[PDB]
Curated annotation (Swiss-Prot):
Listed cofactors: Ca(2+)
An individual GO BP term: arabinan catabolic process
Record pathway: Glycan metabolism; L-arabinan degradation
Record-given protein name: Extracellular endo-alpha-(1->5)-L-arabinanase
Family designation: Belongs to the glycosyl hydrolase 43 family.
Site feature Important for catalytic activity, where: 149
Keyword Cytoplasm attributed: no
Temperature-activity note from the record: Optimum temperature is 73 degrees Celsius. It is fully heat-stable (up to 10 hours) and retains activity at temperatures up to 90 degrees Celsius. The enzyme loses its activity only after 90 minutes when incubated at 95 degrees Celsius.
Active site, renumbered: 11, 202
UniProt: substrate binding residues: 11, 96, 146-149, 166-168, 198-202
Anything else known: Although it functions as an extracellular endo-alpha-(1->5)-L-arabinanase, its sequence is quite divergent from the B.subtilis enzyme.
Length: 449
């Protein structure tokens, strides 16, 4: 019987230190958990007297100076580097301002205190005063990134890379020197991977999967607010520095434009939804609004993958919390997200008896939208048919499920996983599935039991 206690961490970056998992996020929100379920809140704001960075205003005067803010840093990620020490990549900025910088702070202990190390990327240079951008040319917030949202990771060859960006000129990758954690010289902003021209995307994170030998790029498309339609998107590459491709085979290098256009690309993992049969705001029902800015983790001791993200909730406005879901790999080597938060579940072959039945069916679609999707009712029947709200065919091999679902003029194939999970609102073990189509659409099914 899982129980949970969540923490308030916005833009949470996962790091394992010992037998403890730690998330760091915006406003210096920090919390730790042994079990991924019960979180202990360790810091809540970047007030003068916080313990992670005391007197941050003086400690990080270089970045905060640059970004004209105080008593804040956004999007921190702590990584342990090869010297043994903890390196917190962070950014400082102001709301929707291209005036920002990625900095680094450093500590021998995970929980701090962190001190000033480097400022490594800057944006919003006003040529007359500051001279040019990082690439030696005049800054221009259409084609250059906003220096925010560092995602740092090692490649399977021990090279070190930072992916970063938010809106503005897009998402870029810089190769880093593993001994120092600073960018190698003369790459400027790096190589563009996604976006450009004020595309609505931020929060890049690249996780390497030893199970598929691909790098996955995860992004957040849209507004973080209650009405912003924040959703999580995935792409993948053989290479850490791309190019990244979505499940259709489009290149993420081509992903740029209005919200309408960029919604076409990527695999949308999740967006707004509520498991209520009565309305779009039902506090007894499980639901999220604007889930995203995630990170990810591969636990090599168990073989499981997790995603760490923030979310708002239907009817609850801006209030948010940390959530942790298991991610699974489907037959085609794409991630699908467990419908409910992680409850110690470990996939396994289910017999028919546990698969056949009536389901609540959520099709998260492809749009950047603030709409709170609600389920329909489908049936997985013993003869392999699907009926009710949709028509089609299902089949499974082991834990891998395939649904062939008639949708207008066409048959859409979704491929995913089947498993028992804990029903977060219903407090009981149910069968669920989670599958993904080639056009990048995610469907979750929760059996009605
Ligand atoms: Ca970040």
């Amino acid at each position: 019987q899982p129980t949970f206690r969540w923490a308030v961490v916005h833009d949470p970056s996962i790091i394992k230190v010992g037998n403890m998992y730690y998330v760091f996020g915006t406003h210096l929100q920090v919390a730790k958990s042994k079990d991924l379920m019960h979180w202990e809140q360790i810091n809540t704001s970047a007030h003068d007297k916080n313990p992670i960075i005391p007197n941050i205003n003086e400690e990080l005067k270089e970045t905060l100076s640059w970004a004209r803010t105080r008593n804040d840093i956004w999007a921190p990620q702590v990584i342990q580097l090869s010297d043994g020490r903890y390196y917190m990549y962070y950014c400082a900025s102001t709301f929707g301002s291209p005036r920002s910088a990625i900095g680094i702070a450093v500590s021998d202990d995970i929980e701090g205190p962190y001190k000033h190390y480097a400022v490594i990327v800057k944006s919003g240079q006003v040529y007359s005063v500051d001279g040019p951008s990082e690439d030696g040319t005049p800054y221009d917030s259409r084609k250059h990134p906003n220096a925010l949202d560092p995602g740092v990771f090692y490649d399977k060859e021990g090279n070190l890379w930072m992916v970063y960006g938010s809106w503005f000129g897009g998402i870029y990758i810089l190769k880093l020197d593993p001994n120092t954690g600073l960018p190698l010289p003369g790459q400027g902003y790096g190589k563009r991977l996604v976006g450009g021209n004020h595309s609505s995307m931020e929060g890049p994170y690249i996780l390497y999967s030893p199970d598929t030998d691909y790098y996955y790029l995860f992004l957040s498309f849209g507004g973080l607010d209650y009405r912003g339609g924040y959703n999580i998107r995935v792409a993948r590459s053989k290479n850490p520095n791309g190019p990244y491709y979505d499940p259709e085979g489009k290149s993420m290098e081509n992903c740029m434009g209005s919200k309408t256009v960029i919604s076409n690309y990527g695999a949308k993992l999740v967006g707004n939804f509520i498991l209520s049969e009565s309305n779009t705001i039902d506090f007894k029902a499980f639901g999220y609004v604007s889930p995203g800015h995630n990170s990810a983790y591969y636990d090599p001791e168990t073989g499981k993958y997790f995603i760490f993200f923030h979310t708002r909730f239907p009817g609850r406005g801006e209030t948010y919390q940390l959530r942790v879901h298991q991610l699974f790999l489907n037959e085609d080597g794409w991630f699908v997200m467990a419908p409910f938060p992680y409850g110690g579940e470990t996939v396994s072959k289910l017999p028919n008896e546990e698969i056949v039945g009536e389901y609540q069916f959520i099709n998260h679609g492809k749009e950047i939208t603030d709409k709170i999707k609600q389920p329909v009712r489908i049936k997985l029947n013993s003869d392999g048919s699907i009926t009710g709200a949709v028509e089609g065919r299902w089949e499974r091999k082991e834990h891998y499920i395939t649904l062939k679902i008639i949708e207008g003029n066409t048959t859409v194939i979704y491929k995913g996983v089947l498993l028992k999970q804990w029903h977060y609102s219903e407090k009981k073990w149910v069968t669920v599935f989670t599958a993904l189509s080639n056009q990048g659409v995610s469907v979750w099914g929760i059996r009605v039991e």
